[PDB]
Write a protein that binds this ligand. Structure first.
Ligand SMILES: CN(C)C(=O)c1ccc(Nc2cc3c(cn2)cc(-c2cnn(C)c2)n3C(=O)OC(C)(C)C)c(Cl)c1
Length: 252
């Protein structure tokens, strides 16, 4: 029931959505009784390298507002040397939680969600940003529409591209990750969710002789997309602009 001020405007805290390191996301009500999400960040113990990553992701979230509606709306913000307050639109639940709750996944729902993720990840790519770490928790359902919460600028290994393991990279990295999200939305498991051991799992994603199973499904376009996304060589892997012109996304 605590009330906070962001650029003069008063917000009434309804519940706490989540809490990062020195971060806290709340569900709030404004003076017009409209519902929003306020992210509070504590800069007390935050270093100069940390502050720039925060400033950069805010500016990117700010610029990409205009270019796409698949990026979470940033209404207002207040930045001081002590804290950050970001006033964003409120979603229902994140894709990671929603997929964990829903036993059955509708082909239309899946297709519509796939379309959204491609548009969001395409937008960040256009501006030169590659997330490099995509998991369903990065997406949020806002009125039956998937939206991108972060840009990997400011954690499960199942969605990692072989190139991220080989750096022990490029816009094609994000394609691999999106491929695993759709694979979970198609089969109900991640390509390597079978492997409990993390080092045996990492050895499998990097290995080409370890064949990923693509069971026969009533959706042949969905098979081709999954087969196209999950190619270990990023040069051989399908691009986002091509994925957007794919029959799976385009045909009724
Ligand atoms: C605990 N979970 C999974 C929930 O039930 C849940 C998850 C998400 C919810 N909505 C929601 C979450 C939201 C936002 C707007 N709405 C904005 C943000 C946000 C935070 N940083 N940035 C750059 C955007 N956000 C957010 O980060 O939510 C999580 C903490 C759950 C990931 C709500 Cl209302 C509930």
């Amino acid at each position: 029931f605590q009330s906070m001020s962001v650029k003069g405007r008063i917000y009434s805290i309804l519940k706490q959505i989540g809490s990062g390191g020195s971060s806290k996301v709340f569900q709030v009500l404004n003076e017009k009784k409209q519902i929003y999400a306020i992210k509070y960040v504590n800069l007390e113990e935050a270093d100069n390298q940390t502050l720039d990553s925060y400033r950069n992701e805010i500016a990117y979230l700010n610029k990409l507002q205009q270019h796409s509606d698949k990026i979470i709306r940033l209404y207002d913000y207040e930045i001081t040397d002590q804290y950050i307050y970001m006033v964003m639109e409120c979603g229902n639940i994140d894709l990671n939680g929603w997929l964990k709750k829903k036993k059955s996944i509708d082909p239309w729902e899946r297709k519509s969600y796939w379309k959204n993720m491609l548009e969001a990840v395409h937008t960040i790519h256009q501006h030169g940003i590659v997330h490099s770490d995509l998991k369903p928790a990065n997406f949020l359902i806002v009125d039956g529409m998937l939206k991108l919460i972060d840009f990997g600028i400011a954690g499960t290994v199942n969605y990692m591209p072989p190139e991220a393991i080989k750096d022990m990279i490029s816009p094609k990295s994000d394609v691999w990750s999106l491929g695993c999200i759709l694979y979970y939305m198609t089969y109900g498991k991640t390509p390597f969710q079978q492997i409990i051991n993390q080092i045996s799992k990492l050895h499998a994603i990097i290995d080409p002789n370890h064949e990923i199973e693509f069971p026969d499904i009533p959706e042949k376009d969905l098979q081709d997309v999954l087969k196209c996304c999950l190619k270990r060589d990023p040069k051989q892997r399908i691009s986002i602009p091509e994925l957007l012109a794919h029959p799976y996304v385009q045909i009724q």
